[PDB]
Amino acid sequence: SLAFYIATFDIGTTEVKAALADRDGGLHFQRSIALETYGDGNGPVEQDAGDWYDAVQRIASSWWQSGVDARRVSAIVLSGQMQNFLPLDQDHEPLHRAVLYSDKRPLKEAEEINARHGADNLWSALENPMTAASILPKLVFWRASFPQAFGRLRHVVLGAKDYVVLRLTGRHATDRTNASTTGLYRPKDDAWHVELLADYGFSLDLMPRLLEPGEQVGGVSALAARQTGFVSGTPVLCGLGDAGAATLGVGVLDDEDAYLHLGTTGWLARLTQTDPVGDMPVGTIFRLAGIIAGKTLQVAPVLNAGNILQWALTLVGHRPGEDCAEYFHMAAAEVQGVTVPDGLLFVPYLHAERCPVELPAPRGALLGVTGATTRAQILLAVLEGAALSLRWCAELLGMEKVGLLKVVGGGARSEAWLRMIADNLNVSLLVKPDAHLHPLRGLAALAAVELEWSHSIQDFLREADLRESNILHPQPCDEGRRRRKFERFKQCVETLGR
Amino acid sequence: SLAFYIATFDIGTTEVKAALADRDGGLHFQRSIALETYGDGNGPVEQDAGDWYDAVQRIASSWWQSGVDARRVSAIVLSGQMQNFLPLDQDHEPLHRAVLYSDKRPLKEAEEINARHGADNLWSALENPMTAASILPKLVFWRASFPQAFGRLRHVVLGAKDYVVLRLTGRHATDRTNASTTGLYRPKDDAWHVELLADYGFSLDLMPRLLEPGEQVGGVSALAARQTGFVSGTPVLCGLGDAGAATLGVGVLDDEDAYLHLGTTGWLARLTQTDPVGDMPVGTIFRLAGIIAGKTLQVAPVLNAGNILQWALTLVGHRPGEDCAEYFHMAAAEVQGVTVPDGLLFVPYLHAERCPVELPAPRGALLGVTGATTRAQILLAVLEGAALSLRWCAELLGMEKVGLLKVVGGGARSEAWLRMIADNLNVSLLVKPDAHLHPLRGLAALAAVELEWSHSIQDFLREADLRESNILHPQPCDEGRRRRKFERFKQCVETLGR
């Protein structure tokens, strides 16, 4: 016999990762192409969409030239950045650089939209945040500044991998998981928010068609075949937003499954059965549809995360231009066998925050310092404080029934932090290494089901897994005492607001 | 000719310092005897009074055996600990260990006294604090626990050097500066608080006679001559409390002269013309009489001072048993050329405080931390925060007309701190080295006037001074901006109180 593969891609924020997936869950011919970002962190966060496809071309070229036969690639499926704004003309050419999710320039427009429609009405219909990062504001903001370009507007792409899917098949579509993030989509009606788009003079024709991740969008076109070297007619599946693929990739499949992304920034996620939406949160809470039939990923986005620890390296003598390796090492060494006093408390919002609280301005403090306070206790309180933010998020997400938390990211390198998190959230943790491959595993599994390589996604992931860890469980604690420090921690955030 | 000398002593908290003073302001045959303190910092702070005299004997012996002729000693004068409680019997023997000023065990008794008499009445009459450290509470507390000993009570010594003066002459006296500290003395009537002592069943006979520092208490008695080797009849002057002698010693003589003691703990002092006492302060403010005719030293006692800096060495890696030298060095190096952000604020009450605020419990915090905050900025903010406490104290003392601040103590070793203090208090500083000799210079000068060696104290100090510095002046500042950070600093202390 001969090997067949699924071409998997992630169009991520800083790079494009790819691999050819065999039926046994093996990921081969792994590739990585770096993408540039524009804006220098002064407000704008943009990319040239062509770079994404350019990246896909380069990877496919490198595959054929590495002896891979494009006919043995039985399907193409991608994940990528969610919540983009990308305006295209009639020939599918960008009218503007892609504006990324982290761009939040349109403050006044989001304010207006919320005022005009009612925040409770919008929340009630979208089940998600309407903020400066949402697509409607970015679209309004753009129409006003570029009226000519706007005249030529024909399509609005809302996820990075959707553009590449467009380049490949010539059809404009997206997944419900990504749609959720946009603040343009109604989960309950399963449709774009018609009256809201019409009220601002935007046609439905601008919207992509909604598709299941496993549905075929179309086949690779003759032209795309010439551009990439894929075989014309090779199935291109819809795929899904990277949050969806990453969580699928690590086995987040069942009710009360949960996930934690601990990078420079982070997010905590709880999968559950789709329920009637509750009252507006006083903390940005996403509810992503479409990852599993009948289930919703409840996500709390965290802006102060692994960056809190990174900051604290200053405490052990780190300076602006130095490699951080030796300092993470000292910090870990120093907090060994240390205990944090009930009175010592670190509030970790060194940057503006969304969850668990809206803080447009930082609120960073070290409280309860006495003469007996050591630097080691400080370092630890930082981890504790960061973990208390996380417990706050879990409380918002309703995670009291979650048994196990899948953890990814560089943040998990702090053994001391993990311990803080398990203990304070009172949940077990399992670390999942190689976070860059996760969305690819998820995609490969959904593709495998569609190709009839496997009966289910679950079955697929569990096999690759025999291919290759000990769960970390919480120490026993004075529930009630950890709980009192937790409430005080809440009172401190409020009190620091004056 | 041949040298004549004044025997000067300071009966301090941790040691007895002494020297023979010539007429040119020279201090010779310097001695130091260490004293032990009992209580292990668990509440009690006591010493054996006999140790004080024992120390004086040993020093005088060492003088005669070093070729000094006791007849050339023309007067004996001492300073020492103020605000002691020392109960003696009819033979002048202690009925209890001397209870030092820092002892504050009698919480309930001070509370009772204040309730019974009115805090405003007491303040109005005593012009000083009535607290657990005051002599009346300690006396009540002692009578209740030792009724037998109390039956034998005949004299109550209120300053350490007064006991030694008692051992030397056989007369019981004290100075008005020390009397002030006791909460038993009425400045305006110039007398002990009769109704207050009588109301608690204590006779006036227990009180020492009030004397000027320069007045002769008596001559060395035959017996004391045998015990010490001094010449019988050698004048023993009354002398004064160490705060009085230390400030005299450095030239604090004129209205709006000021003084700063920056040790582990500290105090700030402003000399001014005796005025009608104002309303009770919400911050422990002493008003000491008797140092200069018609003038009053206004003192703010600080409990968080050089100990704040000492604590901060933890930040640069200091650990419990290590020598501190190299760490003070790094901290100084690290804050060089650094600026403290207007938003970064350190509240330095790592221990309970009296001035500028009553804080029975610590209130230590680092506020306004952002991601850009460095350790160096932290170190500096600590100094700034400590200095802001000091500015608060100056504001309480009414120091807006003070031109120059005489500074003593190990605290002054931080060049960076001095700069913070000058800038924030907006006053010039002059550091006075060898703080242990200060009370001796002061005593020697007052003695010199009495012996007709010099026409005035001022004249005396200014000469020794030709024997041997650049004043440090404040940088120009946005008054108004330093002032806004100062007010915020006040608001933060209150807000941290919940």
Ligand SMILES: Nc1ncnc2c1ncn2[C@@H]1O[C@H](COP(=O)(O)OP(=O)(O)O)[C@@H](O)[C@H]1O
């Ligand atoms: N050696 C380490 N030990 C502890 N944490 C680490 C270490 N190195 C990196 N980190 C953490 O990794 C975080 C970023 O991880 P990462 O997964 O690359 O997220 P991101 O792609 O968002 O920057 C940092 O903020 C830091 O706290």
Ligand SMILES: Nc1ncnc2c1ncn2[C@@H]1O[C@H](COP(=O)(O)OP(=O)(O)O)[C@@H](O)[C@H]1O
């Ligand atoms: N090398 C130094 N540099 C800066 N400050 C110093 C240094 N060494 C000692 N100190 C300060 O000295 C203070 C104590 O000084 P000191 O005059 O002996 O007062 P005390 O007798 O009350 O303990 C400490 O709290 C510390 O901050």
